Design an enzyme around this catalytic site. Structure first.
Site, PDB file in Angstrom:
ATOM      1  N   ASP A  52       5.078  74.470 -17.021  1.00 27.24           N
ATOM      2  CA  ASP A  52       4.805  74.048 -15.406  1.00 27.24           C
ATOM      3  C   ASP A  52       6.003  74.424 -14.681  1.00 27.24           C
ATOM      4  O   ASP A  52       7.024  73.984 -15.128  1.00 27.24           O
ATOM      5  CB  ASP A  52       4.460  72.540 -15.763  1.00 27.24           C
ATOM      6  CG  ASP A  52       4.350  71.847 -14.182  1.00 27.24           C
ATOM      7  OD1 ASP A  52       2.958  72.018 -13.786  1.00 27.24           O
ATOM      8  OD2 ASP A  52       5.203  71.184 -13.643  1.00 27.24           O
ATOM      9  N   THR A  85       3.000  73.816  -6.986  1.00 29.88           N
ATOM     10  CA  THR A  85       4.708  74.088  -6.938  1.00 29.88           C
ATOM     11  C   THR A  85       4.969  75.274  -7.132  1.00 29.88           C
ATOM     12  O   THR A  85       5.913  75.990  -6.699  1.00 29.88           O
ATOM     13  CB  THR A  85       5.330  73.022  -7.766  1.00 29.88           C
ATOM     14  OG1 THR A  85       4.916  73.415  -9.091  1.00 29.88           O
ATOM     15  CG2 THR A  85       4.607  71.646  -7.609  1.00 29.88           C
ATOM     16  N   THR A  86       4.360  76.011  -8.375  1.00 33.85           N
ATOM     17  CA  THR A  86       4.649  77.485  -8.634  1.00 33.85           C
ATOM     18  C   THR A  86       4.202  78.179  -7.259  1.00 33.85           C
ATOM     19  O   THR A  86       5.109  79.247  -6.989  1.00 33.85           O
ATOM     20  CB  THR A  86       4.108  77.941  -9.752  1.00 33.85           C
ATOM     21  OG1 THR A  86       2.524  77.897  -9.356  1.00 33.85           O
ATOM     22  CG2 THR A  86       4.240  76.930 -10.952  1.00 33.85           C
ATOM     23  N   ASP A 369      -2.995  66.087 -13.606  1.00 31.95           N
ATOM     24  CA  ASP A 369      -3.443  67.035 -12.746  1.00 31.95           C
ATOM     25  C   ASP A 369      -5.026  66.956 -12.466  1.00 31.95           C
ATOM     26  O   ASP A 369      -5.549  67.018 -11.413  1.00 31.95           O
ATOM     27  CB  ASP A 369      -2.814  68.391 -12.764  1.00 31.95           C
ATOM     28  CG  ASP A 369      -3.310  69.061 -14.045  1.00 31.95           C
ATOM     29  OD1 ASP A 369      -4.450  68.760 -14.735  1.00 31.95           O
ATOM     30  OD2 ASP A 369      -3.132  70.411 -14.115  1.00 31.95           O
TER      31      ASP A 369
HETATM   32  N1  LIG Z   1      -8.647  81.414 -14.852  1.00 33.52           N
HETATM   33  C1  LIG Z   1      -8.078  81.897 -13.887  1.00 33.52           C
HETATM   34  N2  LIG Z   1      -8.254  83.195 -13.202  1.00 33.52           N
HETATM   35  C2  LIG Z   1      -7.590  83.505 -12.121  1.00 33.52           C
HETATM   36  N3  LIG Z   1      -6.455  82.909 -11.708  1.00 33.52           N
HETATM   37  C3  LIG Z   1      -5.991  81.598 -12.161  1.00 33.52           C
HETATM   38  C4  LIG Z   1      -7.032  80.907 -13.672  1.00 33.52           C
HETATM   39  N4  LIG Z   1      -6.219  79.916 -13.659  1.00 33.52           N
HETATM   40  C5  LIG Z   1      -5.165  79.569 -12.893  1.00 33.52           C
HETATM   41  N5  LIG Z   1      -5.147  80.983 -12.036  1.00 33.52           N
HETATM   42  C6  LIG Z   1      -4.145  80.670 -10.986  1.00 33.52           C
HETATM   43  O1  LIG Z   1      -2.946  80.557 -11.399  1.00 33.52           O
HETATM   44  C7  LIG Z   1      -2.018  79.910 -10.350  1.00 33.52           C
HETATM   45  C8  LIG Z   1      -1.426  78.508 -10.573  1.00 33.52           C
HETATM   46  O2  LIG Z   1      -2.210  77.389 -11.016  1.00 33.52           O
HETATM   47  P1  LIG Z   1      -1.860  75.798 -11.492  1.00 33.52           P
HETATM   48  O3  LIG Z   1      -1.359  75.943 -12.722  1.00 33.52           O
HETATM   49  O4  LIG Z   1      -2.920  75.025 -11.187  1.00 33.52           O
HETATM   50  O5  LIG Z   1      -0.474  75.509 -10.265  1.00 33.52           O
HETATM   51  P2  LIG Z   1       0.938  75.638 -10.779  1.00 33.52           P
HETATM   52  O6  LIG Z   1       1.147  76.925 -11.544  1.00 33.52           O
HETATM   53  O7  LIG Z   1       1.712  75.328  -9.806  1.00 33.52           O
HETATM   54  O8  LIG Z   1       1.009  74.311 -11.758  1.00 33.52           O
HETATM   55  C9  LIG Z   1      -3.300  79.310  -9.332  1.00 33.52           C
HETATM   56  O9  LIG Z   1      -3.167  79.939  -7.894  1.00 33.52           O
HETATM   57  C10 LIG Z   1      -4.682  79.982  -9.812  1.00 33.52           C
HETATM   58  O10 LIG Z   1      -4.997  80.850  -8.740  1.00 33.52           O
END
Ligand SMILES: Nc1ncnc2c1ncn2[C@@H]1O[C@H](COP(=O)(O)OP(=O)(O)O)[C@@H](O)[C@H]1O
Ligand SMILES: Nc1ncnc2c1ncn2[C@@H]1O[C@H](COP(=O)(O)OP(=O)(O)O)[C@@H](O)[C@H]1O
Ligand SMILES: Nc1ncnc2c1ncn2[C@@H]1O[C@H](COP(=O)(O)OP(=O)(O)O)[C@@H](O)[C@H]1O
Lengths: 505, 500, 478
Positions: A52, A85-86, A369
Site C-alpha cells: 500500500d 494515494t498512490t 477499503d
Molecule cells: N485488475 C486490474 N486491472 C487494471 N488495473 C488495475 C487492476 N487492479 C488495480 N488496478 C489499478 O491500480 C491502481 C491502484 O489501485 P488501488 O490499490 O485501489 O489504489 P492505491 O494503489 O492507491 O491503494 C488503480 O488506479 C487501478 O486502475
C-alpha cells in the site's frame, strides 16, 4: 571552502521539483495490482513488507520540507478515503517532472498553476460525462462479490475470498443506514489475532477479550444476562486487619450484590483467589486482572453504554452479550472469553484468526477499503472504469481542449495531457510489459473506438475492456484524486523560496 | 566584514543589507503573489502569503535590517494594510540612490532631496484624491459590495461572491464600533458545500473528548453564562488517600446547584468516557478551551471566574440571550452566541474539500479588510500601481525645473516610485517591461488613473475598476518609506562594544 | 535496494552451502574472545541460529529457515541453498533486463509443474501396508546421516516402528523423551519411561509407592506474622497429608524443615523439575498443571499408576515404569562431550518427526538428487513448450534445481561437472529409479541402494524455497 546558501526562485523551484521526483518515482513502482511492494524496515528494531502506497509513504521518513508537506497531506487524504494515494502521489510527481521543462521554457509558475487548474476542471467535467455507472448497487449481494475482486486479486486469498466478501456484505447490511451512511470509530471492524489460516477469519458478531479466566474449574459457558463491569481496585496484626478490611469491602460483591443484580461482574486489579472460589460456589463468576480500555468494548455487545463505577451500576445498564454460541476459540491456546449471549452488537466487529501477520494487515486493509468503496456506493452509486482507460480518455479530452485555448493555458494543458498519460505507463511497466508501446496502442484503440473502458490489462487476461474484468472505481474517489493532485501541483508551484532561521553561511 | 568604515563604504554596505532584506519579501506583493515556507526549528514549517507576517518572523541581525524591520512593524501596527510596500519602496529608494553615493554626493544632500520630494508628493496626492464615501455606501450599499467583490472577481467563486460580500458587510454595518480582525474570527468545519456557508454572531468550536463532556444540552436556554473553574473535574494511610479521593469526588458535585452554573469552563482535561457521570450533572461543560474562545466569551457574554472548590458568585448565570449547539457537517459544534455585548461573528467555513483554508483565509480576510478600509475613510485614489505612476510622472516633470544637486535625486526618487506596478505585473507573471512602457505612455499623455490589471494582463482604468485605496494610508506609507530611507542614509558608523 | 538484498541473501546461502550432504564441511562458531574458544558443528541448521544477520532480506530468509527447522524434519540447509541459487539466477536475469513480475509468474508456473512431477513419482512404502522394516531402516538412516550413532541405531528404529501402534494416535510426538549423561560409548542406548530425579529424604524412604497424584506447589512485631504464616503452612502440609499422594512437583524452593514433613507425609518433594518431564507426565500419566494446591482437595488431583526410584549404573537411573500409558519411551544414552547432548537431541527429534510424517503420509520418493533432477527435467520440458520471456525463468529454475545436488557432489570431494551431467543426461532414460551415491562416487540405480526421503518433507522444501525466493525477489526498495 566557499559554500553559499542563497536560494533564488527558479533554482528553488528546480530543487523542489527534484525533491518531489525523489519522493515520487520511488513509490511509483508500487502502483497497480502487481506493483513491486516495498519492504519497510524500522530504523531501530522492526521490519515489514507491504504494497500500500499510503502505508509506505507514512512509514518512510523524508528530510525535505516539500516531501514532508506532500506526505502529510497524503496522510490527510488517506484519512478522508484511504484509496488512490498512490495515484495522487505518482500523478503529482508526473506533473512536476514534466512541468520542469515548461519552467525551462521560461513560463512563470503562476501561469502553469492556473493552466493546470483549468485542465483539471476539463478533466473533471469529461470524466463526469463518460461515467457508465450502475445505480442498482444497493441490494446487490451477488454483484458485491465481484466488486471486491480487484482489491483482493493481488494475492492467493481467492480460495476463501467469497467468505470474507459475504462477511463484508453482512457487515454493511447490519449497519446500513440510509440517512447518514457512515461508520464511526467505535464500530471498527478491526482485531488482529495471531495463528490460524485463511478461512479461520470467519463471521462472528461479538465481543473479543483475550484476558485470563476466573478459575480453571469455573464453567466457561454461562448464559445468565446479569453481566457487569466494575473497576474494583486493590485500594504486626495491622496486615491481618487490612486483609479483613479488604474482605469486608469485597463482601458487597458476595452478599450486597443480590439486591443489585451483578453476577458476572469482572474485576481489573489484584485479588485473592479464595473469594473467587467462594463466588464460584455462589455461582457468580468474575474475571480478574482485565485490561484498561476493554471496559467499553465489553459493554457495547448490545449497543449499550459504559458503566465502570460502583454506584452507577444499574440493572438497565448491566453488562451486554452478543449471541449464544459454543465453539472453542482456542484450539491450542486457552479459550477466549465468551461475551456473546444476548443481542446484536451495534459496534459490530468480525472475528479474525489469520495465521500470518502480513495476512492480518492485508485482510484488515482490504476490509477497510472495501468498506470505504461501499460507503461511497451507498452515498453515491457512481463508478467509472479505471485501469488507465479513464486517464487516457481525460488526456485525449484535454489535448482536444488545447486546440481552442489561450497561450500559456494551452501549453499547461498540453503538459497536463502527457502528465495524465503517466498512469498507464506506470501500470504497464509494473506489469512488466513495454511501458510505452502498450499505452500508445491502447490510446490509438481508444481513439478509434468510442469505448472508454479500453485500458491496460496488467493481469494478462484476454481483452483491454474491463467491463468483463470488473475493474471498477467510483466517481468520487477519482475526482478527489485528480483534484488533490492538481491542488498539489498548484501550491508547490506557488512556493518560490524557503527560509530557515539559524542560517549557517 | 567588507569595508565597514567612515562614510561611503558603510553606506554602501547598509544599502546592500536593505536590498537583501527586501529580497525576502519581494515576490509576495499583490493579492496573488508567491508564497513562502519558513521552518521554526523543531519542525513546524510556516506557510504564509502576507509580507508583514514574513517580516515579523525573520531572523534579522544586521543593524540596517533591524532598523528597517522596526519601521515596517510600526507601519503595520499603526495601519494593518500595507507593510511589504514600504519596505520594498524604501529599498528601491536606497538602490536607486546608491549609484550616486560613491561619486561624492554628500548624504545630507540626499536627505534634503528625499524630504522635499516626499513633501511634494504628499501635496500632489491631495489634489487627486476623490471622495466617494457619501456616494451610496452606508445607505444603498450596492457601490460598497461592487468594490468588495474585486478580491474574488474572475475566480471559481465568481457566482457566489455577491452573497458572501453582502452578508459580511451586513455583519460589519451592525457591528460598526471599530471592528478588529482578532475579535472577528472564522472557523473551519469538515464537510459541506460553499454556497451554504453561514455566519453565527458568536463562536463556533467543535466539542472534542477533552472539550465538552455532556451532550444534548438545553439549547433553548436564555441565561447561559460561563463558569471558569480551575480545579479537576474527572475522577499506614493506604485507606486515607482513598477516603480523601472519594470526598473530593463527592465535593466536585457541590457546584451542581449551590453554585448554579449552566456552563462550566476548566483548563484541566475533561473525560467523555464519564459522560453518563456528567449526565447525572445534566449541564454543559467546557475544557481545554482556546484563548480566542475565552476572550470572545468574556467580552461577549461575560462568564464568571472561579478559583475555590465552592466559589459562589452572582455572575455564574448572568444575562446572555441565547444558547446554540447545532451539528455542523455531522459533528456537533458549540455556539456561545446570544450575548449582551455580542460583538462577535464566527463564519462557518462549510466545504467538502478540506484544503481550502488557505483560499478562504486569503480571500475573505482581504475582502473584509478592503470593505472596512473603504468604510473608514472618505477619499481614495486609483490603485494597482496607478497613483505611483502619477507621482513618478509629476516628480520627473518637477525635477527638470529645479537647478542643482536636488534635480538628479528627485529624478531618481521618481524612478524608484515605479517599482510597485512593476512588481505587481512581475508577480502576476506577465512581461513587466511592456506593461510599464504602455502604462507610462498612456499615463503621461492620456489619463491619471491607469494601473495594472491582474486578470487580462493589460493596462486598465483602475478608477472604473473600483480598485480603491485610501489617500491617508497611501500618504502615510510613502512618508514612512521615505523616512526609513533617510534614516538609513544618515547613518555612517556602527559601534560594537563586544565583550568588555 | 535490490542488489544489496540479493547479495546478502546469496552470501547467507553460500555460508551454509558447504555443509550440504553427508560430507559437509565443519564450521567454527566464533565471537568476541570472552567465550569463543572452540565450537564446531557439521549441521548447517544450527549455524543459522547463531548467525549475526544485518540485511533484513537475509533476516526474512533466516526466519523462513527457522520455520523449516521447527516444522517437519530437517531440510533447512537444502531450502536455504536452493533459495540462494534461485536468487542468483534472478540476479542474472535482471542483469539482462527482465522484469521481476514475469520472472515470478514463470517461477510459479514452474513450481506447480515440479510439484506435480514430484507427486507423480511418489511411491508408497510397505511399513504401513505390508509391514516392511527395511524401508523404515533406510528412512531412519538417511535423516541420521553425518552422524555416528549407528551401533544402537537398532534401538532407534525399534522406537520408530513401535511408535505407529502405541506411541501415536494421529502422529503424536510429545510422548518421547531424551536424556543422557557424560561418560559412555555407543552401546548405552536403552528404553526408559521417566526422568532421573532421586529421593531427597535419605535412605529410609521406600523405593516403591502406592499411587501418584502429582501437582505443583504454590509457595515455599513481624515475628508474630511469620509464626502465623508458619502455622498456615503447617495446616497446608497437614491437608496434603490426607491427600494420599506419593508424587508431587515442587516448583518453588523448599528447605529441610518442611522437606522432612513432606517425606513423613508420603509426599515426595520434586525440587523444581524440568517442565519437559512435567509435560510428559501430563500427557502420558495424567498429572495436570495448576497454580495452587489448596483448592484441589479430592477431584482436582493427578492420575498415575506406579512410580519407582532406582539407581542403575552408578548414576541416578530412576525408571518411571508402570505409568498409565506405555508411550513414554525414553532413550537414555551416555555421551562424552557437551555437543553430544544437543547433537543426539536434534538428530533423534528430526528422525522421529520424519518418521511421524511417513506414518502419516506413506508415499515417498528416492533421495540422492534423483528427485531433484526429475523436477528439473519436468520444468525444462515445460520451458521448451511455452513461449514468452518466462522461458528464461523456468530454465533458470531448472538450473538451480540442477545445481542443488552439484553442491552435494562437491562436498563429498568428488567431481561435479561430469557425474551431475551424466546423471542429467541419463535421467531422460535412466529415470527416477536412478540416483547419486556418495559411498562409491558414481551413478547407480538409487532404488537398490534404498536410500529414500519422505515425500512430505521434500514437497515442503520445494514450496518453502519457491515462496521465500518469490518474496525476496518481489522487494525492490528499502
Ligand atoms: N485488475 C486490474 N486491472 C487494471 N488495473 C488495475 C487492476 N487492479 C488495480 N488496478 C489499478 O491500480 C491502481 C491502484 O489501485 P488501488 O490499490 O485501489 O489504489 P492505491 O494503489 O492507491 O491503494 C488503480 O488506479 C487501478 O486502475
Ligand atoms: N485586484 C487588484 N488589482 C490591482 N491591484 C491590486 C489588486 N488587489 C491588490 N492590489 C495591489 O496590491 C497592493 C497591496 O498588496 P500587498 O502589499 O501585498 O498587501 P498589503 O497591502 O496588505 O501588505 C496595493 O498597492 C494594490 O494596488
Ligand atoms: N547416504 C546418502 N546417499 C545419498 N544421498 C544422501 C545421503 N545422505 C544424505 N543425502 C542427501 O542429502 C540431502 C540432505 O542433506 P543435508 O542438508 O545435510 O541434510 P538435512 O536436509 O537433514 O539438513 C538429501 O536431499 C539427501 O538426498
Amino acid at each position: 571552502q566557499d559554500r553559499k546558501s542563497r536560494l533564488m526562485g527558479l533554482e528553488a523551484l528546480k530543487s523542489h521539483i527534484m525533491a518531489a521526483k525523489a519522493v515520487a518515482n520511488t513509490m511509483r513502482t508500487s502502483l497497480g495490482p502487481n506493483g513491486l511492494d516495498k519492504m519497510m524496515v524500522d530504523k531501530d528494531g522492526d521490519v515489514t513488507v507491504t504494497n500500500d502506497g499510503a502505508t509506505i509513504l507514512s512509514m518512510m521518513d523524508v528530510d525535505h520540507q516539500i516531501a514532508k508537506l506532500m506526505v502529510e497531506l497524503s496522510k490527510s487524504q488517506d484519512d478522508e478515503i484511504g484509496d488512490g494515494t498512490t495515484g495522487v502521489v505518482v500523478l503529482a510527481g508526473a506533473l512536476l517532472e514534466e512541468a520542469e521543462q515548461l519552467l525551462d521554457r521560461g513560463i512563470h509558475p503562476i501561469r502553469i498553476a492556473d493552466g493546470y487548474e483549468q485542465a483539471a476542471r476539463v478533466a473533471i467535467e469529461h470524466l463526469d460525462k463518460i461515467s457508465d455507472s450502475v445505480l442498482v448497487d444497493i441490494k446487490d449481494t451477488e454483484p458485491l462479490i465481484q466488486t471486491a475482486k480487484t482489491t483482493l486479486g493481488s494475492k492467493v486469498v481467492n480460495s476463501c475470498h467469497r467468505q470474507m466478501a459475504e462477511i463484508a456484505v453482512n457487515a454493511v447490511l447490519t449497519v446500513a443506514d440510509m440517512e447518514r451512511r457512515d461508520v464511526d470509530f467505535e464500530l471498527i471492524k478491526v482485531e488482529g489475532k495471531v495463528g490460524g489460516r485463511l478461512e479461520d477469519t470467519k463471521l462472528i458478531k461479538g465481543v473479543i477479550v483475550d484476558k485470563d479466566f476466573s478459575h480453571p474449574q469455573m464453567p466457561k459457558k454461562v448464559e445468565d444476562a446479569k453481566i457487569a463491569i466494575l473497576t474494583c481496585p486493590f485500594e504486626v496484626e495491622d496486615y491481618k486487619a487490612l486483609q479483613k478490611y479488604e474482605k469486608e469491602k469485597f463482601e458487597e460483591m458476595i452478599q450486597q450484590i443480590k439486591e443489585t443484580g451483578a453476577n458476572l461482574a469482572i474485576c481489573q486489579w489484584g485479588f485473592d483467589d479464595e473469594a473467587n472460589h467462594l463466588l464460584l460456589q455462589n455461582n457468580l463468576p468474575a474475571v480478574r486482572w482485565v485490561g484498561g480500555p476493554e471496559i467499553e468494548l465489553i459493554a457495547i455487545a448490545t449497543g449499550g453504554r459504559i458503566v465502570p463505577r460502583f454506584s452507577e451500576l444499574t440493572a438497565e445498564k448491566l453488562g451486554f452479550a452478543g449471541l449464544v454460541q459454543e465453539i472453542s476459540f482456542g484450539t491450542t491456546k486457552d479459550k477466549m472469553l465468551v461475551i456473546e449471549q444476548c443481542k446484536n452488537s451495534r459496534a459490530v466487529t468480525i472475528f479474525i484468526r489469520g495465521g500470518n501477520k502480513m495476512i492480518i494487515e492485508e485482510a484488515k486493509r482490504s476490509l477497510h477499503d472495501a468498506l470505504c468503496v461501499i460507503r461511497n456506493l451507498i452515498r453515491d452509486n457512481r463508478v467509472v472504469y479505471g485501469g488507465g482507460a479513464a486517464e487516457i480518455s481525460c488526456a485525449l479530452a484535454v489535448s482536444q481542449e488545447a486546440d481552442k485555448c489561450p497561450t500559456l493555458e494551452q501549453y499547461a494543458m498540453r503538459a497536463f495531457a502527457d502528465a495524465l498519460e503517466v498512469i498507464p505507463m506506470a501500470l504497464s511497466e509494473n506489469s512488466g510489459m513495454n511501458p510505452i508501446q502498450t499505452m500508445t496502442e491502447v490510446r490509438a484503440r481508444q481513439v478509434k473506438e468510442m469505448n472508454p473502458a479500453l485500458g491496460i490489462d496488467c493481469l494478462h487476461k484476454g481483452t483491454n475492456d474491463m467491463k468483463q474484468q470488473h475493474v471498477i472505481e467510483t466517481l468520487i474517489g477519482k475526482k478527489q484524486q485528480i483534484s488533490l493532485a492538481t491542488q498539489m501541483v498548484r501550491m508547490i508551484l506557488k512556493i518560490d523560496d524557503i527560509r530557515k532561521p539559524g542560517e549557517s553561511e | 566584514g567588507t569595508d565597514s568604515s567612515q562614510g561611503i563604504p558603510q553606506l554602501v554596505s547598509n544599502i546592500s543589507a536593505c536590498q537583501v532584506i527586501a529580497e525576502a519579501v519581494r515576490t509576495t506583493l499583490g493579492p496573488r503573489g508567491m508564497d513562502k515556507l519558513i521552518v521554526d526549528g523543531r519542525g513546524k514549517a510556516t506557510i504564509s502569503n502576507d509580507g508583514a507576517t514574513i517580516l515579523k518572523l525573520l531572523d534579522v541581525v544586521h543593524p540596517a535590517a533591524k532598523t528597517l524591520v522596526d519601521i515596517a512593524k510600526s507601519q503595520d501596527a499603526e495601519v494593518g494594510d500595507g507593510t511589504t510596500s514600504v519596505t520594498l519602496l524604501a529599498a528601491e529608494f536606497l538602490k536607486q540612490v546608491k549609484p550616486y553615493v560613491e561619486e561624492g554626493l554628500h548624504p545630507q544632500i540626499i536627505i534634503r532631496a528625499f524630504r522635499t520630494a516626499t513633501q511634494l508628493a504628499v501635496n500632489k496626492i491631495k489634489e487627486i484624491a476623490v471622495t466617494v464615501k457619501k456616494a451610496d455606501k452606508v445607505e444603498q450599499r450596492k457601490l460598497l459590495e461592487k468594490c468588495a467583490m474585486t478580491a474574488l472577481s474572475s475566480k471559481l467563486i465568481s457566482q457566489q461572491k455577491a452573497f458572501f460580500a453582502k452578508m459580511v458587510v451586513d455583519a460589519v454595518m451592525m457591528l460598526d464600533d471599530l471592528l478588529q480582525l482578532k475579535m472577528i474570527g472564522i472557523k473551519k468545519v469538515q464537510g459541506g458545500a460553499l454556497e451554504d456557508s453561514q455566519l453565527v454572531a458568536g463562536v463556533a468550536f467543535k466539542k472534542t473528548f477533552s472539550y465538552a463532556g455532556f451532550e444534548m444540552q438545553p439549547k433553548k436556554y436564555h441565561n447561559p453564562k460561563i463558569a471558569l473553574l480551575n480545579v479537576e473535574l474527572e475522577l499506614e494511610d493506604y485507606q486515607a488517600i482513598v477516603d480523601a479521593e472519594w470526598n473530593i469526588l463527592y465535593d466536585k458535585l457541590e457546584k451542581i446547584h449551590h453554585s448554579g452554573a449552566k456552563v462550566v469552563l476548566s483548563k484541566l482535561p475533561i473525560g467523555d468516557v464519564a459522560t453518563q457521570y456528567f449526565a447525572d450533572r445534566d449541564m454543559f461543560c467546557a475544557g481545554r478551551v482556546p484563548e480566542e474562545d475565552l476572550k470572545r466569551t468574556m467580552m461577549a457574554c461575560g462568564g464568571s471566574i472561579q478559583t475555590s472548590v465552592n466559589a459562589l458568585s452572582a455572575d455564574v448565570l448572568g444575562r446572555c440571550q441565547v444558547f446554540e449547539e447545532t451539528q455542523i457537517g455531522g459533528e456537533r459544534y458549540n455556539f456561545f452566541t446570544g450575548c449582551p455585548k455580542a460583538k462577535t461573528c464566527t463564519f462557518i467555513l462549510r466545504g467538502g474539500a478540506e484544503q481550502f483554508m488557505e483560499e478562504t483565509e486569503r480571500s475573505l480576510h482581504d475582502a473584509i479588510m478592503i470593505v472596512r478600509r473603504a468604510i473608514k475613510n472618505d477619499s481614495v485614489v486609483a490603485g494597482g500601481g496607478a497613483i505611483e505612476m502619477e507621482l513618478s510622472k509629476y516628480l520627473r516633470d518637477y525635477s527638470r525645473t529645479i537647478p542643482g544637486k536636488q534635480q538628479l535625486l528627485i529624478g531618481a526618487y521618481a524612478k524608484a516610485l515605479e517599482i510597485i506596478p512593476r512588481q505587481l505585473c512581475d508577480n502576476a507573471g506577465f512581461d513587466a517591461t511592456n506593461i510599464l512602457n504602455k502604462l507610462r505612455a498612456r499615463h503621461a499623455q492620456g489619463g491619471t488613473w491607469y494601473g495594472v490589471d491582474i486578470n487580462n494582463e493589460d493596462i486598465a482604468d483602475n478608477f472604473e475598476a473600483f480598485v480603491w485605496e485610501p489617500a491617508m494610508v497611501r500618504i502615510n506609507a510613502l512618508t514612512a518609506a521615505s523616512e526609513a530611507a533617510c534614516l538609513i542614509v544618515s547613518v555612517d558608523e556602527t559601534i560594537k562594544n563586544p565583550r568588555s | 535496494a535490490r542488489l544489496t538484498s540479493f547479495i546478502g541473501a546469496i552470501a547467507i546461502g553460500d555460508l551454509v552451502k558447504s555443509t550440504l550432504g553427508p560430507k559437509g564441511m565443519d564450521k567454527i562458531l566464533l565471537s568476541s574472545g570472552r567465550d569463543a574458544s572452540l565450537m564446531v558443528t557439521n549441521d548447517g541448521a544450527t549455524i543459522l541460529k547463531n548467525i549475526g544477520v544485518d540485511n533484513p532480506a537475509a533476516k526474512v530468509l533466516v526466519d523462513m529457515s527457522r520455520v523449516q527447522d521447527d516444522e517437519v524434519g530437517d531440510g533447512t540447509t537444502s531450502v536455504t541453498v536452493l533459495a540462494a541459487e534461485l536468487l542468483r539466477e534472478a540476479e542474472s536475469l535482471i542483469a539482462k533486463k527482465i522484469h521481476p513480475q514475469t520472472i515470478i509468474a514463470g517461477w510459479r508456473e514452474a513450481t506447480k509443474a515440479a510439484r506435480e512431477a514430484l507427486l507423480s513419482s511418489a511411491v508408497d512404502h510397505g511399513s504401513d501396508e505390508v509391514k516392511f522394516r527395511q524401508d523404515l531402516m533406510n528412512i531412519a538412516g538417511t535423516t541420521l546421516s553425518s552422524k555416528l550413532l549407528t551401533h544402537h541405531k537398532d534401538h532407534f528404529t525399534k522406537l520408530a516402528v513401535e511408535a505407529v501402534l502405541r506411541l501415536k494416535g494421529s502422529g503424536n510426538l510429545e510422548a518421547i523423551h531424551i536424556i543422557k549423561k557424560l561418560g559412555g560409548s555407543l552401546a548405552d542406548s536403552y528404553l526408559d519411561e521417566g526422568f532421573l530425579l532421586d529421593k531427597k529424604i535419605g535412605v529410609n524412604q521406600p523405593k516403591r509407592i502406592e499411587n501418584a497424584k502429582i501437582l505443583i506447589a504454590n509457595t515455599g512485631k513481624v515475628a508474630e506474622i511469620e509464626h502465623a504464616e508458619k502455622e498456615k503452612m503447617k495446616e497446608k502440609v497437614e491437608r496434603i497429608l490426607k491427600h494420599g499422594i506419593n508424587c508431587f512437583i515442587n516448583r518453588q524452593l523448599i528447605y529441610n524443615y518442611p522437606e522432612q514433613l513432606f517425606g513423613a507425609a508420603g509426599v515426595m518433594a520434586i525440587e523444581h523439575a524440568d517442565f519437559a518431564g512435567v509435560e510428559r507426565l501430563a500427557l502420558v500419566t495424567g498429572g495436570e498443571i495448576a497454580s495452587t494446591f489448596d483448592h484441589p482437595e479430592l477431584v482436582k488431583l493427578g492420575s498415575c499408576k506406579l512410580i519407582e526410584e532406582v539407581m542403575i549404573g552408578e548414576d541416578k537411573l530412576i525408571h518411571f515404569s508402570g505409568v498409565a500409558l506405555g508411550e513414554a519411551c525414553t532413550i537414555v544414552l551416555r555421551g562424552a562431550t557437551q555437543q553430544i547432548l544437543d547433537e543426539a537431541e536434534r538428530s533423534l527429534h528430526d528422525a522421529l518427526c520424519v518418521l511421524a510424517q511417513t506414518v502419516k503420509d506413506s508415499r515417498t520418493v528416492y533421495g540422492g538428487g534423483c528427485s531433484e533432477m526429475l523436477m528439473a527435467h519436468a520444468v525444462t520440458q515445460l520451458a521448451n513448450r511455452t513461449p514468452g520471456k518466462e522461458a528464461v525463468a523456468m530454465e533458470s529454475y531448472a538450473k538451480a534445481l540442477r545445481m542443488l545436488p552439484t553442491i552435494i557432489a562437491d562436498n563429498a570431494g568428488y567431481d561435479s561437472a561430469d557425474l551431475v551431467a551424466q546423471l542429467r543426461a541419463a535421467h531422460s532414460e535412466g529415470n527416477t529409479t536412478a540416483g547419486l551415491d556418495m559411498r562409491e562416487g558414481t551413478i547407480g540405480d538409487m532404488a537398490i541402494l534404498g536410500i529414500t526421503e519422505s515425500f512430505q518433507v521434500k514437497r515442503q522444501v520445494l514450496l518453502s524455497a519457491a515462496e521465500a525466493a518469490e518474496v525476496i525477489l518481489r522487494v525492490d526498495n528499502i
